């Protein structure tokens, strides 16, 4: 009975909006099973036979009732359900690690690009081609507007 303590807002953040209902049902069943494990102890109080040896005046029936009980093999239910969610967790950790590697690629790209923007030439020593290769948004569309000023006159 070694349980995994859980955050509930953290549990909320990792649930896609197409299975919020299942998350809430898991939550309600977690709470219900906590409650029901609270209100019942672990092992029944096995009543002493003394009050049942000296006051059942019937012929040896108590003794077979107690023999059938001391030799009772009550069935402990086995899991049959945790291994497959462990397999699903393995698959999910695979997906998560590959997406993480992609995000680390994007992050290293962003850090290279931010070093590029961080090390620009001072703007008073900058040609126009240096600006057009720094912020390429600032390049005249010499394709659509081939004649001077290479932009709409209202833009000027």
């Amino acid at each position: 009975l070694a349980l995994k303590t859980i955050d509930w807002v953290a549990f909320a953040e990792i649930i896609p909006q197409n299975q919020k209902a299942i998350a809430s049902s898991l939550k309600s069943w977690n709470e219900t099973l906590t409650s029901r494990l609270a209100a019942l102890p672990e092992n029944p109080p096995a009543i002493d036979w003394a009050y049942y040896k000296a006051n059942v005046a019937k012929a040896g029936l108590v003794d077979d009732f107690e023999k059938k009980f001391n030799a009772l093999k009550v069935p402990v239910p086995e899991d049959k359900y945790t291994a497959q969610v462990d397999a699903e967790e393995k698959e999910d950790v695979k997906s998560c690690a590959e997406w993480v590697s992609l995000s680390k690629a994007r992050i290293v790209e962003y850090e290279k690009e931010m070093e590029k923007m961080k090390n620009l030439i001072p703007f008073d020593q900058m040609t126009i081609e240096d600006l057009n290769e720094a912020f390429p948004e600032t390049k005249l569309d010499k394709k659509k507007y081939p004649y001077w000023p290479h932009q709409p006159i209202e833009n000027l």
Partner: protein
């Protein structure tokens, strides 16, 4: 390549200071002006500069030009300087804005990585519920079997008890009703005890 800061230090808008310095060592500080006076007077006296209507056209244009620069030169200088400062500030702010955009993007990505690292709670919750359900069913089974066996044993004890009860009640009322079915000795003994009443 950065531009210099200052120009070439002309004097009267016509003559650079290099000339006055160049004539300093040999004719002092008054050499250039003496030379200018001499050249003007030689041009005048010998009809190299013919005074005509163009003298006064030139005087009027030169007066308008000197007055123009002196009065609206500060304004034009400050206008050019403000144009450059505004373009510089706009470019710097665009730079800082792009820096901030990509820094925010990096932060967003690291936050997504934090979330994806937090992912595992779904499976530990499901595993919790499986273990707890199996334990609940086990304990329900043990209470059911205990309570059933005890209920049978207590039914035995209860049937025994109420059989004994009905039987003893019938016993006592039989023995009372049956001694009624059964004496001068007690006749005298009553008076004996009445005398013993004292």
């Amino acid at each position: 390549p950065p531009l210099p800061e200052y120009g070439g230090k002309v004097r009267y808008g016509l003559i650079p200071e290099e000339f006055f310095q160049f004539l300093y060592p040999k004719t002092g500080v008054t050499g250039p002006y003496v030379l200018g006076t001499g050249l003007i007077l030689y041009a005048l006296s010998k009809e190299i500069y013919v005074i005509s209507a163009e003298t006064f056209t030139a005087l009027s244009v030169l007066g308008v030009m000197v007055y123009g620069i002196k009065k609206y030169g500060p304004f034009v200088a400050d206008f050019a300087d403000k144009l450059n400062e505004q373009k510089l500030a706009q470019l710097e702010e665009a730079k800082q804005a792009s820096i901030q955009h990509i820094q925010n993007a990096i932060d967003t990505e690291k936050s997504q990585q934090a979330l994806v690292q937090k992912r595992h709670y779904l499976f530990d919750v499901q595993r919790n519920n499986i273990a707890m359900a199996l334990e609940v069913t086990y304990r329900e089974r043990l209470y059911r079997v205990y309570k059933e066996v005890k209920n049978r044993l207590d039914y035995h004890i209860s049937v025994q008890n109420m059989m004994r009860r009905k039987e003893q009640e019938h016993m006592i009322n039989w023995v009372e009703k049956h001694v009624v079915q059964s004496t001068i000795a007690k006749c005298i003994a009553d008076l004996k005890l009445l005398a013993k009443k004292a």
